[PDB]
Amino acid sequence: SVLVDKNTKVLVQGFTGKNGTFHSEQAIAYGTNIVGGVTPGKGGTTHLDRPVFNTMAEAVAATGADASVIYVPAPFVKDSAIEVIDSGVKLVVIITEGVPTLDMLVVKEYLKDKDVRVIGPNCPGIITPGECKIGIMPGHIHMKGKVGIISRSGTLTYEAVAQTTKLGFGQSTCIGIGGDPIPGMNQIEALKLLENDPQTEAIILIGEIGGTAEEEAAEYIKHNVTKPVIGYIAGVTAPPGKRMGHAGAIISGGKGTAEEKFAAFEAAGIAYTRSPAEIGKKLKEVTGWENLYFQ
Amino acid sequence: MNLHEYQAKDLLESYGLKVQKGIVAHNPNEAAQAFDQLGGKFAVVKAQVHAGGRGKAGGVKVVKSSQETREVAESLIGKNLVTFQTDAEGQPVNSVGVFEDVYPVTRELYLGAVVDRSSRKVTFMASTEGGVDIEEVAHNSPEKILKVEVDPLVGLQPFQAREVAFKLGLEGKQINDFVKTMLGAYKAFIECDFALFEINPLAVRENGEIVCVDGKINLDSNALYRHPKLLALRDKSQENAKELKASEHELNYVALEGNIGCMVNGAGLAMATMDIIQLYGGKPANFLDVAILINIFGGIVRCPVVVRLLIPADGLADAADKVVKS
Numbered sequence A: 001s002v003l004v005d006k007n008t009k010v011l012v013q014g015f016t017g018k019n020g021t022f023h024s025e026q027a028i029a030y031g032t033n034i035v036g037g038v039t040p041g042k043g044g045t046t047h048l049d050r051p052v053f054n055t056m057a058e059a060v061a062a063t064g065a066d067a068s069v070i071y072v073p074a075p076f077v078k079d080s081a082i083e084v085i086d087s088g089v090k091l092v093v094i095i096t097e098g099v100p101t102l103d104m105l106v107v108k109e110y111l112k113d114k115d116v117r118v119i120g121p122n123c124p125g126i127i128t129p130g131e132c133k134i135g136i137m138p139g140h141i142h143m144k145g146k147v148g149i150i151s152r153s154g155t156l157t158y159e160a161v162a163q164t165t166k167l168g169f170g171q172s173t174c175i176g177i178g179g180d181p182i183p184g185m186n187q188i189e190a191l192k193l194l195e196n197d198p199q200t201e202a203i204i205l206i207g208e209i210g211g212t213a214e215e216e217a218a219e220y221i222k223h224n225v226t227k228p229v230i231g232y233i234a235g236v237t238a239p240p241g242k243r244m245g246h247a248g249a250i251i252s253g254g255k256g257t258a259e260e261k262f263a264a265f266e267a268a269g270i271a272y273t274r275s276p277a278e279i280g281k282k283l284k285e286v287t288g289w290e291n292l293y294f295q
Numbered sequence B: 001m002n003l004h005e006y007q008a009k010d011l012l013e014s015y016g017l018k019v020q021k022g023i024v025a026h027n028p029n030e031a032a033q034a035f036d037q038l039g040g041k042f043a044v045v046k047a048q049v050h051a052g053g054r055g056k057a058g059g060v061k062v063v064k065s066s067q068e069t070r071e072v073a074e075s076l077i078g079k080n081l082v083t084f085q086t087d088a089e090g091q092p093v094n095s096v097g098v099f100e101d102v103y104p105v106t107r108e109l110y111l112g113a114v115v116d117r118s119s120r121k122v123t124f125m126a127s128t129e130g131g132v133d134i135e136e137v138a139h140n141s142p143e144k145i146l147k148v149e150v151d152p153l154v155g156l157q158p159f160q161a162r163e164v165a166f167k168l169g170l171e172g173k174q175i176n177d178f179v180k181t182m183l184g185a186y187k188a189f190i191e192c193d194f195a196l197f198e199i200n201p202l203a204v205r206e207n208g209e210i211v212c213v214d215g216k217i218n219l220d221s222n223a224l225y226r227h228p229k230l231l232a233l234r235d236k237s238q239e240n241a242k243e244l245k246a247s248e249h250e251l252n253y254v255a256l257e258g259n260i261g262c263m264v265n266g267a268g269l270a271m272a273t274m275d276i277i278q279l280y281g282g283k284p285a286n287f288l289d290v291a292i293l294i295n296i297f298g299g300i301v302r303c304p305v306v307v308r309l310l311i312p313a314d315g316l317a318d319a320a321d322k323v324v325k326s
């Protein structure tokens, strides 16, 4: 696994909010260590039988947390992100949708000399099945296993998880890097982690329209990733110049299209499927692994 | 969010950029009065729509009188303009701009900026090859596209704008004027949360003046909550009506040209759903994100008509198959 495991101590920023409450309850039911949370003005209270703090400095001093998940509305995310980066927390997961691009440009540049990883924003988070979930993903569709997953989407990631759970392969760690133009963690950063994780025996890379991240990732894999990589690109059929829900999902000036991501996979020797239903099947074909749930 | 030409010019003029000044006319009489107010021999009447290619579509006209301005404003206001950057129904013309003539222009330059996803930096692009398809220049002659990556701590520095000015062949006072233009554009970019801007052409007049003649400003819609005056520029008439209706219920709708509808949770899964239909012979009508295929998985979202969770379906492939077979 990478970054999160059964020892990870998790703080929740916006813990007392609707989504902070719901997803923290699901994380606790999954066996994730939710040590408490921060909501300015609710310091010294209890929520879900865990302490609430006014500040991340107080929360880290009290709990020794090493991870935080952000469920704060978009206008407060830059402030919440700098606060947690300054706190001593090593891993930050930002679920929030609608964060201004120029706020993430500043937060990403702020990270360059820090010992802190940021996943998101606009992402489902990170899960090491059987050990720790940080985010909104349904625990029960996952199973501890050997496939690492990197995706720019939420629900589409769940298709790749369901397919690998149903074939009995399972997942080592799954990272939803999110759909925004400047994520805190990009595909290459995540591919390096999975390459160096012994539990990960193969990698699924899920992308879509927008940017050159998949083309760049393909060039990285060709020379730096030895494990089998299976690609899938959503959005063959998207019209150009149209935001397809995700802020980062747009074809601008003949660039960010799907068939050139598929062409960069071919040039790098990276196997891919054109069917979202066949990610697990392509992985089985490439690896020659047994489907123990067939018989 | 797109701005009108007149809005983009008022904004850039407030940052000290020199623009082809004009007056917005909401009827033909205001247009006539505008031609007189400018006090030029010639004016240029431009249909105010959010789409380029207005000139070739008949939406840009040189006029030489108040009555001629009234006439052109008459022919344009209230008729949808169809350009290569609209669809077959085009965009409503509720106003024209009446603009000063910048004739004669010596040179057309290009200047733009985006958030570059690869470098994660605000990046300017400039070229001597203005007033044309900048994509075609970039393809045929990439050495003619100058790029400047801006460091977020120090921002755009005069030396960076001077390096570009000398490479564009600018001379004497034009260098200083271009530096002011590029520094103003950067300040605007950050202070207004631009997603992109383009000045095409950035004209050099006979007398050496550097003037923004046309182009585009797109704002980051994620940031409009902190720019109430920019959010107030929104022109809902330029948006697709079906897209606009859906968005007011915070639903993401994009219309396509097919005959299968689909309802999905997640933008990635919505594209994958469309793609697995077109994989099974179907033509998607639409992208939709909360004959019709309903396809819900569920992360934050807690769980003829085909339903994959009335014809029921068991996996992704089943649903794509079933729904095209209908």
Ligand SMILES: CC(C)(COP(=O)(O)OP(=O)(O)OC[C@H]1O[C@@H](n2cnc3c(N)ncnc32)[C@H](O)[C@@H]1OP(=O)(O)O)[C@@H](O)C(=O)NCCC(=O)NCCS
Pocket (backbone or CB within 6 Å): A013, A014, A015, A016, A017, A018, A019, A020, A038, A039, A040, A070, A071, A072, A073, A074, A076, A079, A080, A095, A096, A097, A098, A122, A123, A124, A136, A153, A154, A155, B299, B300
């Ligand atoms: C982030 C998001 C989930 C919050 O929605 P929500 O849970 O309904 O919001 P709420 O207002 O109920 O809760 C937000 C909380 O953050 C708190 N908060 C605000 N600023 C804060 C800060 N700087 N630090 C910590 N907490 C903060 C608020 O005080 C509030 O808690 P309270 O209600 O107890 O006061 C929502 O804005 C959003 O982005 N939803 C979409 C997420 C998504 O789909 N992502 C993609 C997944 S693939």
